[PDB]
Each structure stands twice: as structure tokens, then as C-alpha cells.
């Protein structure tokens, strides 16, 4: 089932989400399957549970081909609960992000180039990966939703923030 | 004539505009008359020349009744060239702003409660006023366009930035 994506300004995107405690259940699997489905209809690359007004530490992400980022390499289709993230280095890198909760807009945002992330697949097996570049950016961005944080509060150069069909900033 | 309002992301909103040097002319009066007209069709309270892709230190503003700010007091209908602004005190005050170049969105923004502003009416007589509260906020906000600055770069609390029809932050 496709769920409404709530838009920036809803208080529900501003909460600290509690942990997922129903790993391996049929309710989690249905909620995850709804998320991939919702992500896909909106042509997302990442979607976090609080974006559909579900207060949980859960995110889906990944794709082969992105309509929005035709230059990005495949990121594996992933559902991750109870995400924890550690930078593997201090190197930052700028890149364009948008967000299905902030339709029409984008900005350049600095993110760690290299991370490890850990948590659980919805069946409850542990997931643990090193990620870099766009894969890492997607995960950091979706994690931010689980702590009530959207990308505008991370913009350093406001010249790069604008509507997607009007911008000609060259990164 | 109603002119297109260019949207955030256009480089033309990011320039430092030169001064108006055709005070009292028929070209300025036509451009000003276009601005009030454009402001009015979009239900604006302020419009700055760079918002219609005109690179000049010129802004129009004011209204009796605002559809957008039904709680605001009348601000006189004003066209101002070569605006210069000085705070009359250090007191800041938060208030909701939006912007016709960033449709659909609003945020709370701190501004000086008290200013003086000076410049010229389009006929070239000097204008010099003390302003406070919403009147002062409008003028400071439009001035920012004349230096290539939009309101997101002024937001301090990103919880208050969201779409107009979804927000329930209580100022
Ligand atoms: F525009 C949206 F499709 C969107 N969602 C994202 C999630 C992470 C990084 C970039 C993103 N862009
Ligand atoms: F939403 C728009 F109509 C708009 N334009 C503005 C100009 C100054 C202050 C607040 C404003 N809000
Ligand atoms: Na919060
Ligand atoms: Na600039």
C-alpha cells in the first residue's frame, strides 16, 4: 500500500524515533513493503519511516537506475532498522540532495565521504556495511530523519539552494 | 504589465544590484507600475526588482489588507530606490516570512524591530522613515534581495521552516 509522504513543516518529521522492536514480524514486513512501494511511486532513492508519519528507526533505500540522479551508481535495495552510523574518516564531500518531504527543491550538502552503518534487516539478521560517496550520503540523509533533522539545516552555501528546474549551480 | 517572478535557484536573485540612476523618468515609472501590478496579482506585500530579473536597487511594498497576513496592520504603498537601512536599536524580533520567489514555504526569521530607511521615490524626492515591526520586517526582507540574500540563510530555528499549509509551529 502506497502511503502519504508528509511534507516539511509537519511536527512528525521533527521527532526522535524509537527503536524497532518487532524484527521478523509480519507487521514490520508489511510496513517495509509499503515503504519500498511508496519510495518507488515517488521515484525516491531513500525513504525514512517518519516521512510516512511512522515513528520508528527504520528506512528503506537503493535503486539500479534513478530518474532523479541519472549519474549515480546502483545502491543495493535495503531495508534497515535501528541504524547506527560512524564516519570512517574526516573527509567531507559536497553533493546535491533533495527530499520527497520538500518537493521541487534541492541544495548542495556536505556529508562524510566514508561511513560504516549497522542495524538489522527486517527479518532480524544484522546488517553492517562500509559505504562511500552517494551510498553513504543516502544513508546519512535518511538517518537524519530518524533524529528529526532535514537537509536545509545542513546547507552551508545558500547559493545552491533553489528549485530543481531553475538551478544552474555547477558543483 | 505583469512580469514573471523568477524563483529561488536563479542566479539573478544572488547579485548585488546597482543603483537606480533614472529617477523621474518614464522608464522607471513604467517599471515601478509593473512592480506594483506584479506584486498585486501574486498577493505580495513586498517585491524587489531582482525578483522580476531587473538588476536595480528598487523595491515596492505595502497594502491595506493582506490575504497572506490577515493579522498585519496597513503598511503604506511605497516604491523605494537606492534603499539604505540602519537599525534604531539592537532589539531583534521573530516573525513569519515567505517570499514569492520561494512559493509554498515559510519560516520564522529574526529581524530588527526598529529601523530607519532612506532612499528615493521614483519621482526623485527623498524618502526617509522610521519603521517598526512588520513594516520594518518587509523593508529589511526586500533590501536583502538587493544584496543577493534570501530568507533561508537567515533562519535560526529550522523547526519553523516548512510548507504553509502543513505548518503548526506556534510563534
Ligand atoms: F529528491 C529526492 F528524491 C531525494 N531523496 C534523497 C535521499 C537522500 C539523498 C538525496 C535524495 N534526494
Ligand atoms: F509570502 C510572501 F507573500 C511574502 N513576501 C514577503 C516580503 C516580506 C516579508 C514577508 C513576506 N511574505
Ligand atoms: Na527535534
Ligand atoms: Na551573492
GROMACS .gro file of C-alpha atoms and ligand atoms in nm:
model
  368
    1UNK     CA    1   0.000   0.000   0.000
    2UNK     CA    2   0.127   0.346  -0.105
    3UNK     CA    3   0.133   0.585   0.195
    4UNK     CA    4   0.115   0.963   0.205
    5UNK     CA    5   0.452   1.127   0.237
    6UNK     CA    6   0.416   1.406   0.493
    7UNK     CA    7   0.581   1.742   0.397
    8UNK     CA    8   0.836   1.966   0.579
    9UNK     CA    9   0.653   2.166   0.848
   10UNK     CA   10   0.474   1.860   0.991
   11UNK     CA   11   0.590   1.816   1.354
   12UNK     CA   12   0.612   1.445   1.294
   13UNK     CA   13   0.938   1.485   1.088
   14UNK     CA   14   1.095   1.666   1.387
   15UNK     CA   15   1.079   1.378   1.647
   16UNK     CA   16   1.349   1.142   1.771
   17UNK     CA   17   1.209   0.800   1.659
   18UNK     CA   18   1.221   0.494   1.899
   19UNK     CA   19   1.374   0.167   1.800
   20UNK     CA   20   1.216  -0.106   1.603
   21UNK     CA   21   1.131  -0.397   1.839
   22UNK     CA   22   0.928  -0.618   1.607
   23UNK     CA   23   1.203  -0.761   1.391
   24UNK     CA   24   1.088  -1.077   1.200
   25UNK     CA   25   0.725  -0.986   1.236
   26UNK     CA   26   0.450  -0.973   0.977
   27UNK     CA   27   0.365  -0.608   1.075
   28UNK     CA   28   0.720  -0.490   1.017
   29UNK     CA   29   0.741  -0.681   0.683
   30UNK     CA   30   0.413  -0.515   0.570
   31UNK     CA   31   0.533  -0.170   0.680
   32UNK     CA   32   0.867  -0.222   0.496
   33UNK     CA   33   0.689  -0.343   0.183
   34UNK     CA   34   0.468  -0.031   0.199
   35UNK     CA   35   0.787   0.184   0.229
   36UNK     CA   36   0.956   0.038  -0.081
   37UNK     CA   37   0.633   0.074  -0.264
   38UNK     CA   38   0.589   0.439  -0.152
   39UNK     CA   39   0.953   0.509  -0.229
   40UNK     CA   40   0.914   0.367  -0.580
   41UNK     CA   41   0.591   0.557  -0.678
   42UNK     CA   42   0.757   0.887  -0.582
   43UNK     CA   43   1.081   0.789  -0.758
   44UNK     CA   44   1.277   0.820  -0.430
   45UNK     CA   45   1.626   0.685  -0.360
   46UNK     CA   46   1.575   0.670   0.022
   47UNK     CA   47   1.263   0.691   0.242
   48UNK     CA   48   1.257   0.704   0.623
   49UNK     CA   49   0.961   0.581   0.832
   50UNK     CA   50   0.893   0.923   0.988
   51UNK     CA   51   0.832   1.055   0.629
   52UNK     CA   52   0.519   0.846   0.619
   53UNK     CA   53   0.426   0.952   0.981
   54UNK     CA   54   0.557   0.624   1.133
   55UNK     CA   55   0.764   0.695   1.440
   56UNK     CA   56   1.035   0.427   1.407
   57UNK     CA   57   1.405   0.387   1.345
   58UNK     CA   58   1.355   0.238   1.001
   59UNK     CA   59   1.450   0.343   0.647
   60UNK     CA   60   1.447   0.189   0.301
   61UNK     CA   61   1.677   0.288   0.018
   62UNK     CA   62   1.859   0.183  -0.302
   63UNK     CA   63   1.794   0.151  -0.677
   64UNK     CA   64   1.954   0.035  -1.006
   65UNK     CA   65   1.863   0.347  -1.217
   66UNK     CA   66   1.744   0.678  -1.060
   67UNK     CA   67   1.525   0.914  -1.271
   68UNK     CA   68   1.643   1.198  -1.037
   69UNK     CA   69   2.019   1.109  -1.030
   70UNK     CA   70   2.096   0.960  -1.371
   71UNK     CA   71   2.474   0.997  -1.289
   72UNK     CA   72   2.464   0.791  -0.961
   73UNK     CA   73   2.589   0.425  -0.940
   74UNK     CA   74   2.348   0.145  -0.822
   75UNK     CA   75   2.292   0.132  -0.443
   76UNK     CA   76   2.154  -0.212  -0.324
   77UNK     CA   77   1.782  -0.228  -0.230
   78UNK     CA   78   1.799  -0.215   0.151
   79UNK     CA   79   1.562  -0.201   0.449
   80UNK     CA   80   1.746  -0.106   0.772
   81UNK     CA   81   1.616  -0.090   1.130
   82UNK     CA   82   1.793   0.067   1.430
   83UNK     CA   83   2.059   0.229   1.207
   84UNK     CA   84   2.379   0.342   1.371
   85UNK     CA   85   2.642   0.541   1.179
   86UNK     CA   86   3.019   0.614   1.229
   87UNK     CA   87   3.238   0.817   0.991
   88UNK     CA   88   3.538   0.611   0.872
   89UNK     CA   89   3.729   0.938   0.813
   90UNK     CA   90   3.702   1.312   0.848
   91UNK     CA   91   3.677   1.377   0.476
   92UNK     CA   92   3.361   1.570   0.380
   93UNK     CA   93   3.219   1.585   0.029
   94UNK     CA   94   2.958   1.811  -0.127
   95UNK     CA   95   2.675   1.671  -0.334
   96UNK     CA   96   2.317   1.755  -0.441
   97UNK     CA   97   2.035   1.625  -0.217
   98UNK     CA   98   1.656   1.664  -0.230
   99UNK     CA   99   1.383   1.505  -0.025
  100UNK     CA  100   1.033   1.377  -0.104
  101UNK     CA  101   0.907   1.579   0.201
  102UNK     CA  102   1.045   1.903   0.041
  103UNK     CA  103   0.919   1.860  -0.325
  104UNK     CA  104   1.062   2.077  -0.602
  105UNK     CA  105   1.382   2.186  -0.420
  106UNK     CA  106   1.746   2.082  -0.383
  107UNK     CA  107   2.073   2.203  -0.229
  108UNK     CA  108   2.436   2.104  -0.208
  109UNK     CA  109   2.509   1.943   0.132
  110UNK     CA  110   2.836   1.829   0.288
  111UNK     CA  111   2.837   1.467   0.413
  112UNK     CA  112   3.106   1.221   0.519
  113UNK     CA  113   3.255   1.055   0.214
  114UNK     CA  114   3.311   0.728   0.413
  115UNK     CA  115   3.091   0.564   0.673
  116UNK     CA  116   3.010   0.238   0.834
  117UNK     CA  117   2.648   0.173   0.909
  118UNK     CA  118   2.497  -0.114   1.124
  119UNK     CA  119   2.144  -0.230   1.221
  120UNK     CA  120   1.905  -0.503   1.121
  121UNK     CA  121   1.729  -0.635   0.814
  122UNK     CA  122   1.352  -0.664   0.882
  123UNK     CA  123   1.393  -1.044   0.930
  124UNK     CA  124   1.629  -0.954   1.214
  125UNK     CA  125   1.964  -1.052   1.071
  126UNK     CA  126   2.236  -0.799   1.148
  127UNK     CA  127   2.347  -0.568   0.864
  128UNK     CA  128   2.688  -0.399   0.877
  129UNK     CA  129   2.838  -0.213   0.579
  130UNK     CA  130   3.106   0.029   0.476
  131UNK     CA  131   2.972   0.283   0.232
  132UNK     CA  132   3.113   0.578   0.040
  133UNK     CA  133   3.002   0.864  -0.187
  134UNK     CA  134   2.634   0.854  -0.289
  135UNK     CA  135   2.551   0.527  -0.100
  136UNK     CA  136   2.691   0.684   0.218
  137UNK     CA  137   2.513   1.014   0.153
  138UNK     CA  138   2.176   0.843   0.114
  139UNK     CA  139   2.217   0.656   0.441
  140UNK     CA  140   2.334   0.968   0.634
  141UNK     CA  141   2.042   1.169   0.492
  142UNK     CA  142   1.782   0.904   0.587
  143UNK     CA  143   1.941   0.864   0.930
  144UNK     CA  144   1.890   1.238   0.987
  145UNK     CA  145   1.512   1.187   0.958
  146UNK     CA  146   1.528   0.933   1.245
  147UNK     CA  147   1.661   1.218   1.466
  148UNK     CA  148   1.423   1.493   1.341
  149UNK     CA  149   1.664   1.664   1.107
  150UNK     CA  150   1.611   1.771   0.742
  151UNK     CA  151   1.882   1.884   0.491
  152UNK     CA  152   1.820   2.264   0.496
  153UNK     CA  153   1.970   2.280   0.848
  154UNK     CA  154   2.282   2.131   0.690
  155UNK     CA  155   2.326   2.372   0.389
  156UNK     CA  156   2.646   2.582   0.413
  157UNK     CA  157   2.621   2.765   0.084
  158UNK     CA  158   2.270   2.907   0.036
  159UNK     CA  159   2.352   2.998  -0.332
  160UNK     CA  160   2.300   2.629  -0.413
  161UNK     CA  161   1.951   2.602  -0.254
  162UNK     CA  162   1.671   2.651  -0.509
  163UNK     CA  163   1.406   2.486  -0.722
  164UNK     CA  164   1.519   2.189  -0.925
  165UNK     CA  165   1.401   2.319  -1.265
  166UNK     CA  166   1.564   2.666  -1.228
  167UNK     CA  167   1.905   2.586  -1.066
  168UNK     CA  168   2.230   2.615  -1.273
  169UNK     CA  169   2.491   2.598  -0.991
  170UNK     CA  170   2.776   2.385  -1.121
  171UNK     CA  171   2.911   2.159  -0.845
  172UNK     CA  172   0.233   4.473  -1.735
  173UNK     CA  173   0.258   4.168  -1.505
  174UNK     CA  174   0.614   4.026  -1.506
  175UNK     CA  175   0.736   3.676  -1.430
  176UNK     CA  176   0.865   3.636  -1.080
  177UNK     CA  177   1.186   3.433  -1.101
  178UNK     CA  178   1.222   3.151  -0.840
  179UNK     CA  179   1.498   3.069  -0.584
  180UNK     CA  180   1.786   2.897  -0.767
  181UNK     CA  181   1.801   3.160  -1.044
  182UNK     CA  182   2.146   3.327  -1.028
  183UNK     CA  183   1.980   3.659  -1.087
  184UNK     CA  184   1.845   3.669  -0.724
  185UNK     CA  185   2.205   3.627  -0.598
  186UNK     CA  186   2.359   3.952  -0.744
  187UNK     CA  187   2.442   4.283  -0.577
  188UNK     CA  188   2.212   4.525  -0.770
  189UNK     CA  189   2.347   4.871  -0.889
  190UNK     CA  190   2.176   5.193  -0.805
  191UNK     CA  191   1.884   5.345  -0.978
  192UNK     CA  192   2.004   5.646  -1.185
  193UNK     CA  193   1.690   5.729  -1.379
  194UNK     CA  194   1.482   5.889  -1.107
  195UNK     CA  195   1.189   6.096  -1.252
  196UNK     CA  196   1.199   5.911  -1.579
  197UNK     CA  197   0.919   5.750  -1.776
  198UNK     CA  198   1.112   5.414  -1.787
  199UNK     CA  199   1.143   5.399  -1.409
  200UNK     CA  200   0.774   5.497  -1.363
  201UNK     CA  201   0.671   5.216  -1.605
  202UNK     CA  202   0.897   4.964  -1.429
  203UNK     CA  203   0.756   5.067  -1.087
  204UNK     CA  204   0.399   5.045  -1.214
  205UNK     CA  205   0.477   4.695  -1.347
  206UNK     CA  206   0.617   4.603  -0.999
  207UNK     CA  207   0.305   4.710  -0.807
  208UNK     CA  208   0.098   4.532  -1.060
  209UNK     CA  209   0.308   4.212  -1.036
  210UNK     CA  210   0.310   4.240  -0.658
  211UNK     CA  211  -0.069   4.269  -0.652
  212UNK     CA  212  -0.150   3.972  -0.886
  213UNK     CA  213   0.064   3.744  -0.668
  214UNK     CA  214  -0.084   3.888  -0.348
  215UNK     CA  215   0.262   4.002  -0.230
  216UNK     CA  216   0.336   4.251   0.049
  217UNK     CA  217   0.684   4.345  -0.089
  218UNK     CA  218   0.853   4.285  -0.426
  219UNK     CA  219   1.215   4.368  -0.515
  220UNK     CA  220   1.331   4.442  -0.872
  221UNK     CA  221   1.573   4.147  -0.884
  222UNK     CA  222   1.266   3.917  -0.828
  223UNK     CA  223   1.149   4.011  -1.173
  224UNK     CA  224   1.508   3.976  -1.316
  225UNK     CA  225   1.569   4.356  -1.309
  226UNK     CA  226   1.910   4.430  -1.165
  227UNK     CA  227   1.836   4.752  -0.971
  228UNK     CA  228   1.819   4.886  -0.618
  229UNK     CA  229   1.442   4.920  -0.625
  230UNK     CA  230   1.155   4.764  -0.430
  231UNK     CA  231   0.782   4.818  -0.393
  232UNK     CA  232   0.578   4.726  -0.088
  233UNK     CA  233   0.271   4.798   0.128
  234UNK     CA  234  -0.101   4.713   0.145
  235UNK     CA  235  -0.423   4.785   0.340
  236UNK     CA  236  -0.540   4.418   0.381
  237UNK     CA  237  -0.307   4.117   0.316
  238UNK     CA  238  -0.465   3.780   0.217
  239UNK     CA  239  -0.141   3.615   0.347
  240UNK     CA  240  -0.108   3.813   0.676
  241UNK     CA  241  -0.463   3.888   0.788
  242UNK     CA  242  -0.320   3.990   1.135
  243UNK     CA  243  -0.076   4.258   1.000
  244UNK     CA  244  -0.150   4.638   1.021
  245UNK     CA  245  -0.159   4.851   0.697
  246UNK     CA  246   0.186   4.941   0.556
  247UNK     CA  247   0.172   5.245   0.313
  248UNK     CA  248   0.203   5.169  -0.063
  249UNK     CA  249   0.568   5.259  -0.129
  250UNK     CA  250   0.818   5.248  -0.417
  251UNK     CA  251   1.177   5.298  -0.292
  252UNK     CA  252   1.501   5.334  -0.491
  253UNK     CA  253   1.856   5.319  -0.352
  254UNK     CA  254   1.735   5.196  -0.011
  255UNK     CA  255   1.970   5.231   0.281
  256UNK     CA  256   1.887   5.081   0.622
  257UNK     CA  257   2.011   5.141   0.984
  258UNK     CA  258   1.880   4.962   1.295
  259UNK     CA  259   1.749   5.213   1.552
  260UNK     CA  260   1.820   4.956   1.828
  261UNK     CA  261   1.964   4.613   1.888
  262UNK     CA  262   1.630   4.452   1.965
  263UNK     CA  263   1.553   4.154   1.738
  264UNK     CA  264   1.206   4.009   1.687
  265UNK     CA  265   1.092   3.682   1.534
  266UNK     CA  266   0.813   3.672   1.278
  267UNK     CA  267   0.687   3.459   0.987
  268UNK     CA  268   0.817   3.548   0.638
  269UNK     CA  269   0.763   3.393   0.294
  270UNK     CA  270   0.867   3.507  -0.049
  271UNK     CA  271   0.703   3.498  -0.393
  272UNK     CA  272   1.035   3.351  -0.530
  273UNK     CA  273   1.003   3.056  -0.282
  274UNK     CA  274   0.627   2.964  -0.329
  275UNK     CA  275   0.453   2.739  -0.077
  276UNK     CA  276   0.704   2.783   0.211
  277UNK     CA  277   0.759   2.999   0.518
  278UNK     CA  278   0.988   3.027   0.822
  279UNK     CA  279   1.030   3.233   1.134
  280UNK     CA  280   1.311   3.488   1.085
  281UNK     CA  281   1.470   3.733   1.329
  282UNK     CA  282   1.477   4.097   1.211
  283UNK     CA  283   1.541   4.432   1.379
  284UNK     CA  284   1.224   4.553   1.546
  285UNK     CA  285   1.319   4.921   1.472
  286UNK     CA  286   1.483   5.070   1.165
  287UNK     CA  287   1.523   5.384   0.970
  288UNK     CA  288   1.521   5.352   0.596
  289UNK     CA  289   1.614   5.624   0.333
  290UNK     CA  290   1.619   5.647  -0.049
  291UNK     CA  291   1.407   5.799  -0.321
  292UNK     CA  292   1.053   5.789  -0.451
  293UNK     CA  293   1.054   5.718  -0.829
  294UNK     CA  294   0.989   6.092  -0.896
  295UNK     CA  295   1.318   6.153  -0.715
  296UNK     CA  296   1.201   6.308  -0.393
  297UNK     CA  297   1.390   6.179  -0.090
  298UNK     CA  298   1.209   5.930   0.137
  299UNK     CA  299   1.322   5.882   0.497
  300UNK     CA  300   1.120   5.682   0.752
  301UNK     CA  301   1.136   5.516   1.089
  302UNK     CA  302   0.965   5.180   1.081
  303UNK     CA  303   0.894   4.904   1.331
  304UNK     CA  304   0.752   4.550   1.350
  305UNK     CA  305   0.600   4.421   1.024
  306UNK     CA  306   0.666   4.744   0.821
  307UNK     CA  307   1.033   4.722   0.921
  308UNK     CA  308   1.048   4.348   0.851
  309UNK     CA  309   0.910   4.393   0.499
  310UNK     CA  310   1.166   4.660   0.418
  311UNK     CA  311   1.461   4.457   0.563
  312UNK     CA  312   1.347   4.148   0.370
  313UNK     CA  313   1.318   4.335   0.037
  314UNK     CA  314   1.651   4.507   0.099
  315UNK     CA  315   1.811   4.162   0.134
  316UNK     CA  316   1.714   4.087  -0.229
  317UNK     CA  317   1.909   4.397  -0.343
  318UNK     CA  318   2.223   4.231  -0.196
  319UNK     CA  319   2.156   3.874  -0.323
  320UNK     CA  320   2.022   3.732   0.000
  321UNK     CA  321   1.704   3.526   0.060
  322UNK     CA  322   1.541   3.442   0.399
  323UNK     CA  323   1.653   3.075   0.435
  324UNK     CA  324   2.011   3.195   0.502
  325UNK     CA  325   1.861   3.388   0.793
  326UNK     CA  326   1.658   3.104   0.963
  327UNK     CA  327   1.791   3.015   1.312
  328UNK     CA  328   1.533   2.757   1.409
  329UNK     CA  329   1.480   2.507   1.125
  330UNK     CA  330   1.175   2.356   1.308
  331UNK     CA  331   0.978   2.658   1.184
  332UNK     CA  332   1.069   2.616   0.813
  333UNK     CA  333   0.804   2.421   0.619
  334UNK     CA  334   0.515   2.439   0.376
  335UNK     CA  335   0.249   2.695   0.453
  336UNK     CA  336  -0.049   2.454   0.452
  337UNK     CA  337   0.116   2.195   0.684
  338UNK     CA  338   0.293   2.413   0.949
  339UNK     CA  339   0.154   2.433   1.309
  340UNK     CA  340   0.451   2.600   1.486
  341UNK     CA  341   0.305   2.850   1.730
  342UNK     CA  342   0.516   3.168   1.738
  343LIG     F1  343   1.493   1.423  -0.426
  343LIG     C1  344   1.463   1.311  -0.352
  343LIG     F2  345   1.434   1.209  -0.440
  343LIG     C2  346   1.579   1.266  -0.270
  343LIG     N1  347   1.575   1.181  -0.163
  343LIG     C3  348   1.701   1.164  -0.115
  343LIG     C4  349   1.758   1.091  -0.010
  343LIG     C5  350   1.897   1.100   0.005
  343LIG     C6  351   1.982   1.178  -0.077
  343LIG     C7  352   1.931   1.251  -0.183
  343LIG     C8  353   1.792   1.247  -0.204
  343LIG     N2  354   1.708   1.304  -0.294
  344LIG     F1  355   0.481   3.516   0.124
  344LIG     C1  356   0.512   3.628   0.052
  344LIG     F2  357   0.394   3.690   0.018
  344LIG     C2  358   0.592   3.725   0.131
  344LIG     N1  359   0.666   3.829   0.082
  344LIG     C3  360   0.724   3.895   0.185
  344LIG     C4  361   0.809   4.006   0.196
  344LIG     C5  362   0.847   4.044   0.327
  344LIG     C6  363   0.805   3.978   0.445
  344LIG     C7  364   0.720   3.869   0.439
  344LIG     C8  365   0.679   3.825   0.311
  344LIG     N2  366   0.599   3.723   0.267
  345LIG    NA1  367   1.359   1.764   1.715
  346LIG    NA1  368   2.582   3.700  -0.399
   0.00000   0.00000   0.00000
